[PDB]
Motif scaffolding. Structure first.
Motif, PDB file in Angstrom:
ATOM      1  N   UNK B 175       0.754  -1.237   0.000  1.00  0.00           N
ATOM      2  CA  UNK B 175       0.000   0.000   0.000  1.00  0.00           C
ATOM      3  C   UNK B 175       0.788   1.293   0.000  1.00  0.00           C
ATOM      4  N   UNK B 176       0.725   2.007   1.119  1.00  0.00           N
ATOM      5  CA  UNK B 176       1.385   3.284   1.250  1.00  0.00           C
ATOM      6  C   UNK B 176       2.365   3.283   2.389  1.00  0.00           C
ATOM      7  N   UNK B 177       3.048   4.400   2.530  1.00  0.00           N
ATOM      8  CA  UNK B 177       4.091   4.571   3.535  1.00  0.00           C
ATOM      9  C   UNK B 177       3.733   5.480   4.709  1.00  0.00           C
ATOM     10  N   UNK B 178       2.455   5.602   5.026  1.00  0.00           N
ATOM     11  CA  UNK B 178       2.027   6.465   6.116  1.00  0.00           C
ATOM     12  C   UNK B 178       0.719   6.000   6.739  1.00  0.00           C
ATOM     13  N   UNK B 179       0.701   5.971   8.068  1.00  0.00           N
ATOM     14  CA  UNK B 179      -0.504   5.612   8.783  1.00  0.00           C
ATOM     15  C   UNK B 179      -1.225   4.394   8.277  1.00  0.00           C
ATOM     16  N   UNK B 180      -2.526   4.559   8.084  1.00  0.00           N
ATOM     17  CA  UNK B 180      -3.302   3.416   7.644  1.00  0.00           C
ATOM     18  C   UNK B 180      -3.053   3.043   6.206  1.00  0.00           C
ATOM     19  N   UNK B 181      -2.258   3.792   5.480  1.00  0.00           N
ATOM     20  CA  UNK B 181      -2.000   3.324   4.137  1.00  0.00           C
ATOM     21  C   UNK B 181      -0.970   2.212   4.209  1.00  0.00           C
ATOM     22  N   UNK B 182      -0.333   2.023   5.367  1.00  0.00           N
ATOM     23  CA  UNK B 182       0.683   0.975   5.503  1.00  0.00           C
ATOM     24  C   UNK B 182      -0.048  -0.289   5.835  1.00  0.00           C
ATOM     25  N   UNK B 183       0.027  -1.273   4.941  1.00  0.00           N
ATOM     26  CA  UNK B 183      -0.699  -2.509   5.117  1.00  0.00           C
ATOM     27  C   UNK B 183       0.182  -3.720   5.263  1.00  0.00           C
ATOM     28  N   UNK B 184       0.421  -4.167   6.513  1.00  0.00           N
ATOM     29  CA  UNK B 184       1.269  -5.358   6.729  1.00  0.00           C
ATOM     30  C   UNK B 184       0.432  -6.625   6.494  1.00  0.00           C
ATOM     31  N   UNK B 185       0.857  -7.469   5.554  1.00  0.00           N
ATOM     32  CA  UNK B 185       0.143  -8.686   5.252  1.00  0.00           C
ATOM     33  C   UNK B 185       0.622  -9.797   6.163  1.00  0.00           C
ATOM     34  N   UNK B 186       0.174  -9.716   7.412  1.00  0.00           N
ATOM     35  CA  UNK B 186       0.530 -10.683   8.409  1.00  0.00           C
ATOM     36  C   UNK B 186       0.150 -12.088   7.965  1.00  0.00           C
ATOM     37  N   UNK B 291     -10.081  -5.408   4.231  1.00  0.00           N
ATOM     38  CA  UNK B 291     -10.684  -4.207   4.819  1.00  0.00           C
ATOM     39  C   UNK B 291      -9.573  -3.195   4.957  1.00  0.00           C
ATOM     40  N   UNK B 292      -8.451  -3.670   5.519  1.00  0.00           N
ATOM     41  CA  UNK B 292      -7.313  -2.810   5.681  1.00  0.00           C
ATOM     42  C   UNK B 292      -6.947  -2.144   4.364  1.00  0.00           C
ATOM     43  N   UNK B 293      -6.964  -2.932   3.287  1.00  0.00           N
ATOM     44  CA  UNK B 293      -6.608  -2.485   1.964  1.00  0.00           C
ATOM     45  C   UNK B 293      -7.546  -1.390   1.522  1.00  0.00           C
ATOM     46  N   UNK B 294      -8.800  -1.526   1.910  1.00  0.00           N
ATOM     47  CA  UNK B 294      -9.797  -0.551   1.530  1.00  0.00           C
ATOM     48  C   UNK B 294      -9.530   0.768   2.253  1.00  0.00           C
ATOM     49  N   UNK B 295      -9.239   0.731   3.556  1.00  0.00           N
ATOM     50  CA  UNK B 295      -8.927   1.961   4.288  1.00  0.00           C
ATOM     51  C   UNK B 295      -7.747   2.619   3.617  1.00  0.00           C
TER      52      UNK B 295
END
Lengths: 313, 313
Positions: B175-186, B291-295
């Motif tokens: 995703x992105x490099x800030x806040x909720x745009x950072x999406x760790x695919x645990x 969902x995370x991806x959507x945020x």
């Protein structure tokens, strides 16, 4: 692996030194101690995905915790040269800093190997020695003044002169860690090499004034930090490999010695499981080096005395 | 080996990054550029007995010389601000800096691989893209936003939770490099692992606020510099191994992509002789991640637009 503590981890040297130690695979625990900003530096370092586990320590009240159980204490601790600062007002400050920290080390980890970087090494190592002596924890096998950046600079400057890759060059450097007490043994360079007279002179002067060179380049606002962190870590790593039990780990260090009539002197030392396994003598010097050796002993002796007396009072 | 330039080398990140690059064996030439203190950092760095040859560059008038002939540009340039932020006065300032520096890159080395770190990546990478497009040097295979510290953090935090050594952990972060745009695919963690819901949430939140965590630890006076330099070098190295011709060099990075409906997105990419050899899609996501991806997409689009519009005006 080993436990390492860095006293003055938040300073100019400390920070990048902490970063490199954090990356060292032989480090299992890393303790960062300072009187300011340690928490911050520590958080930053802690995010690194390397083996070493890092913890931070802030203030004198936390010094003991930081030192406990450590295998290696790296001490770049000390204050910035200013302007205003003389070279003594400084010594007075750093001597106190070293004294304090050493008292801490004496109390909490008598058997940890100490890498003392606090300027001026020529005096602070003797200061440290006195403190340990005055506390009964003195083991000359375990006190090392870091002169590695002298060697580092030597290798770099010689390689450039020789048009070689610095990694393929080794220059033994002995004596002390300041000015003319720094004695690069160009005659012992590896690979065997020939220098013109002007080269020997340029090299010797430049290696002796490396620090000043960086200071001036930083327009008085700062002194060498990165090359220092790099040298300090190369040295710490050698100490760890020695602790690990590797054979042949040899490096130059300002240590307690009987190589000369001086009680402390920098020369090659073999690092093993208990710290210094062997202090090597200077080896064959040419005339230029013998003369240099004499200039160095003269200044070194007073520098050694300034530190001894600092404590012996 | 390769030629590397660091724009903003005298800063918080720059200095330690310069130090590490200097130690990287694939680097043959190291250029260090800044608008202040470049000479001092460079002198310091030059004493290091490593292969890389380093040269310094100070001020806009020297930028072109710094960029010429580079194989890799690493751009941590940017200001801090700290007290009266906004993140929108900053943006103004850094968007400026990025624009200027990118204009310079557009001119002097259209084919150099660019590692952009200037915050906010989510916007500055699109700003950079705009500049390159508006100059006809835009190669989307050669502009990479460094999101590595996100991965680094993830590996570290996940390892802690799983009681593993961070070195044996891998976490894709997209995703992105800030806040909720950072999406760790645990869900895609290697080695295969199970997390409790609370762990998934703690890890996700902590990876998203990593930077804030350091900023706060630093008592507002500064942000992550060491782990950043460390992360940046790790990434720059992969880029170099790509250039070298190594097979299988894969790393996450914020890049021009067609993985989602957004023009720029972070995902695993394969690095080769020409920069990005392949942008991998996100791979299987679980519900939490979708969902995370959507945020993320929602915040990222705006951020991508703030960047684009900055230039398209």
């Amino acid at each position: 692996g080993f436990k390492v503590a860095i006293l003055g981890a938040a300073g100019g040297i400390g920070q990048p030194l902490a970063m490199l130690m954090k990356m060292n695979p032989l480090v299992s625990v890393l303790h960062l101690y300072d009187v300011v900003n340690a928490p911050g530096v520590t958080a930053d370092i802690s995010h690194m995905d390397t083996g070493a586990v890092v913890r931070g320590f802030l203030g004198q009240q936390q010094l003991e915790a930081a030192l406990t159980g450590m295998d290696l204490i790296i001490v770049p601790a000390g204050v910035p040269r200013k302007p205003g600062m003389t070279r003594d007002d400084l010594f007075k400050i750093n001597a106190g800093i070293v004294k304090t920290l050493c008292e801490g080390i004496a109390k909490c980890c008598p058997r940890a190997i100490v890498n003392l970087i606090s300027n001026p090494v020529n005096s602070t190592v003797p200061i440290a020695a006195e403190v340990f002596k005055k506390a009964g924890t003195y083991d000359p096998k375990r006190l090392l003044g870091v002169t590695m950046l002298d060697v580092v600079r030597a290798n770099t400057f010689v390689a450039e002169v020789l048009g070689l890759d610095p990694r393929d060059v080794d220059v033994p450097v002995v004596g002390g860690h300041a000015g003319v007490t720094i004695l690069p043994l160009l005659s012992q360079v590896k690979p065997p090499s020939s220098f013109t007279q002007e080269e020997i002179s340029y090299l010797t002067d430049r290696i002796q004034n490396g620090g000043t060179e960086v200071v001036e380049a930083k327009a008085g606002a700062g002194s060498a930090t990165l090359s220092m962190a790099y040298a300090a870590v190369k040295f710490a790593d050698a100490c760890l490999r020695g602790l690990r039990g590797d054979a042949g780990v040899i490096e130059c260090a300002f240590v307690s010695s009987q190589v000369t009539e001086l009680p402390f002197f920098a020369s090659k030392v073999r690092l093993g499981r208990n710290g210094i396994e062997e202090v090597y003598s200077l080896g064959p010097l040419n005339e230029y080096e013998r003369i240099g050796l004499e200039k160095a002993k003269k200044e070194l002796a007073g520098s050694i005395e300034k530190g001894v007396s600092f404590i012996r009072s």
